[PDB]
Design a protein around this ligand. Structure first.
Ligand SMILES: COc1ccc(Nc2ncnc(Nc3ccccc3S(=O)(=O)C(C)C)n2)c(OC)c1
Ligand SMILES: COc1ccc(Nc2ncnc(Nc3ccccc3S(=O)(=O)C(C)C)n2)c(OC)c1
Ligand SMILES: N[C@@H](CCCC[NH3+])C(=O)O
Ligand SMILES: N[C@@H](CCCC[NH3+])C(=O)O
Lengths: 486, 477
């Protein structure tokens, strides 16, 4: 009951075993089968049917202890997120390697044990290892919480050990990244690594982290996006390139925002806005079908206490032009240029009339993003959708819209009001790029060397995982989300 | 002849073209076939075999120029010829004369035409129409030398051996991911920013939390904690940051792969290392023996035979066999410390500052053992516990660990050991998070780490680590 008492007395137990000549952290256990392999091998067994001739070395963590008397011990053995029973029987025990009561009265919950024993099914039909000998491989000194907070995030091993849904969540995350990596690779894409720190932070609009490099003696910027070096690789003839990796934005932490998060950015030469749209639809529909066998998934947008909303990932997804729909909903045209004093003040007026929060700073791109957020981002929640054709001031690195002046060929896919995908036709015309004289002289010079018509796309893998694992917080899909020390 | 004049007059030509209604950066070209697909569907065709009926839209970059024009098109690192003949050219989309002398070198162009072979046997496409997609306003060189590392796009467009280098890099990382995944390993992401960092950390500041975070020097601790959490085969491929000095084999930000494998022993990790290196080398080259220019391209390559098993060399016992001195235990005793400094002094090797026991052991191994097998990869094994405080103790050799350290051409590429999962067996507990994970119970586990850039160096025949990183962190002028 007292945690310090349980920990201190189990440490005392460790030293008691050591003083007793038994190493509680033995050097090695020659495991022969994993718990999933055990379950797959011996699932087709009748109740009460042993396989006594088959001597297996299996390992796992003890998660339950019970007794039908001092002579019969029941345990729960977990390994790789799968469970079998442990049916210690005084008869099947090797009494020449230890006392049965001694060898099993010491086992507590959380204990990593190695078991020499045979497979079978109990009279209750439970798949079990019947141990002839059981070796504690690693003592869990602390008391393992039953199902109990910030702890899940800090000591993530506890969260993975007690909550099966947590391991399911992270297995889904890796399955998502595997599916995306495989998807791109099947489409001829080439996975690369670009620097995590650069002399600038370009690709998006966010505060960068600053870190000091000693041997170069300079303050480098943790990359906010992989956009620029990837487009440089497109210049370098890798026409189908991508990168899955962490990007850092030194901004606010909330349930959908982490300072560091897993982006996937691909750049696909000779691909236009429709190629990016079709890619987004194909990718999300195929990934959701892969992960669920259906295109419709449930998601607790308003938390687990409220009824979930069904998100239909059936393509095509609707595309909505931001400025057209802002002018429609707000019944005011945003005159170009969108950062003219008139247009800036007009957007501020629309925001003020609607009691929508004015963003810091009230730049026309930020005001446009706030207008989109309020008026169009939270109005398709049954399916994902694209907000498209953003003003060029919102996306300096996007190619100009062919037929709509001042707009771009940008697509940004939202799921339940959250931006999971940002894509557009890359601006390949160096003269048409402002800030070519943050911005890179290296990137602008690469543009001057010829960037082919490219389509770029970026995926917030953490957010996508949030939606496909039914998690409301991004801290629930990152194994060790950055937390405040206590 | 002038780079700047060529740039400026190409830009003036750009503004001209834009002012004459012509778009030198068109929005979308419906390319139907790719250059590799082209050199596949028409690789084996009769010399002189044209196909007038089959129309194809193809893109590429012009790399060479020459009523009969000849170009070179490269796409995805593969070349074809272009035969501009106005016999098949569509003048309604522009006169052939004006539309072909206009194209300069390095232009990304789209081409509507038909495949064929010429009377000389060269495989080409005859364009009925050719569109400039993106002009190269600077002159691309041919020979080129920091241009390689800074403007890597030129290095990938020109050399095509760097393209093969980085395709081999991605093939190596792909193969490593597939190799681990097939072995039941689960890929995860652990934080790149930590609250704690043997090397200097990268310090950054998070503003919202108003606190300094250190870029991870390794994926070690969180991966071990994941092992505690029941992810018994866990791994991470990603950047780790050691804020120290660059050289040809150390870059402060480098790609590490670290796996932790619950219930793995020393033999397990050794077998994994041999399997992975032999099978990766075979997956790449179809053989276990590779040719690597150890001392540069000016010298003859050495053959490295990745045929398993690889030699295992105990660091202490090989130091004692090479230098003919016996080192008492503990290895940090005053007598053994002063003895250890003495072999370095006797060989005029440099003394590490500070002269810590593990540092002197590192220096002795580096001079004496690490250059004992260059014809094959090999293992320096069983490092003393003062060299590997997170490593399990050797069971039959006192004071040693089950550590294994794989080397190719005297450069280390693999560090591995069984974890000291007994919390009370290391004074590092009496990281708080890591020690608490141990207290919750870490099984016997084998951990391993791979220097991806170094493995790529050795499999791409590159002497420097900047050659296997696409954008090495360079020094501005
Ligand atoms: C702007 O200042 C920021 C930006 C980002 C994060 N952090 C974070 N973490 C997980 N996901 C996302 N996504 C996202 C956010 C915003 C917009 C678009 C996207 S996105 O469509 O995923 C795209 C990455 C393709 N951001 C942050 O927090 C500190 C602050
Ligand atoms: C201690 O101070 C350092 C350390 C390392 C780097 N950077 C770097 N860069 C590329 N490779 C390696 N490898 C390596 C180096 C040393 C030892 C082992 C290995 S390793 O076997 O590759 C490993 C991945 C198992 N280190 C550095 O940068 C300035 C500073
Ligand atoms: N770099 C963008 C994603 C790619 C946009 C198209 N190049 C972002 O971080 O939002
Ligand atoms: N932390 C090691 C890799 C694994 C060592 C044992 N788990 C390194 O960076 O070299």
């Amino acid at each position: 009951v007292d945690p310090r008492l349980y920990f201190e007395n189990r440490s005392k137990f460790i030293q008691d075993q050591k003083d007793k000549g038994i190493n509680p952290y033995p050097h090695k256990f020659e495991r022969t089968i994993s718990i999933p392999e055990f379950i797959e091998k011996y699932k087709d067994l009748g109740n009460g049917e042993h396989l006594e001739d088959t001597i297996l070395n299996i390992t796992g963590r003890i998660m339950r202890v019970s007794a039908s008397g001092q002579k019969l011990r029941f345990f729960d053995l977990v390994g790789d997120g799968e469970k079998i029973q442990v049916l210690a029987n005084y008869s099947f025990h090797n009494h020449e390697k230890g006392n049965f009561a001694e060898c099993y009265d010491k086992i507590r919950r959380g204990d990593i044990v190695g078991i020499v024993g045979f497979p079978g099914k109990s009279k209750k039909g439970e798949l079990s290892i019947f141990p002839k000998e059981t070796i504690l491989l690693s003592a869990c000194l602390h008391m393992l919480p039953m199902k109990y907070t910030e702890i899940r995030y800090r000591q993530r091993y506890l969260d993975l050990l007690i909550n099966e849904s947590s391991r399911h969540t992270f297995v889904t995350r890796t399955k998502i990244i595997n599916f995306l990596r495989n998807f791109l690779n099947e489409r001829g894409f080439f996975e690369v690594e670009t620097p995590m720190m650069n002399l600038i932070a370009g690709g998006a609009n966010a505060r960068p982290f600053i870190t000091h490099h000693n041997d170069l003696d300079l303050d480098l910027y943790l990359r906010i996006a992989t956009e620029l070096p990837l487009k440089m690789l497109i210049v370098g003839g890798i026409d189908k390139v991508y990168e899955i990796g962490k990007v850092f934005r030194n901004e606010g932490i909330d349930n959908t925002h982490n300072p560091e998060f897993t982006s996937c950015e691909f750049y696909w030469a000779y691909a236009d806005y429709n190629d990016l749209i079709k890619w987004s639809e194909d990718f999300f529909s195929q990934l959701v079908y892969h992960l669920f066998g259906t295109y419709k998934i449930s998601y607790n947008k308003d938390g687990p206490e409220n009824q979930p909303i069904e998100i239909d990932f059936t393509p095509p997804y609707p595309k909505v032009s931001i400025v057209e729909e802002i002018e429609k909903v707000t019944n005011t045209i945003l005159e170009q240029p969108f950062d003219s004093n008139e247009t800036i003040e007009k957007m501020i007026n629309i925001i003020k009339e609607h009691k929508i929060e004015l963003p810091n700073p009230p730049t026309a791109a930020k005001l446009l993003d706030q207008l989109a957020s309020h008026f169009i981002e939270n109005k398709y929640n049954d399916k994902p959708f694209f907000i498209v054709e953003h003003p060029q001031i919102m996306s300096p690195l996007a190619k100009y819209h062919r037929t709509k002046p001042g707009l771009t060929e940008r697509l940004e896919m939202f799921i339940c009001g959250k931006e999971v995908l940002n894509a557009y036709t890359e601006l390949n015309d160096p003269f048409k790029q402002k800030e070519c004289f943050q911005l890179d002289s290296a990137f602008c010079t690469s543009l001057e060397y010829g960037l082919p018509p490219t389509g770029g796309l970026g995926l917030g893998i953490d957010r996508i995982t949030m939606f496909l694992t039914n998690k409301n917080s991004i801290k629930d899909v990152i194994l060790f989300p950055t937390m405040r020390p206590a």
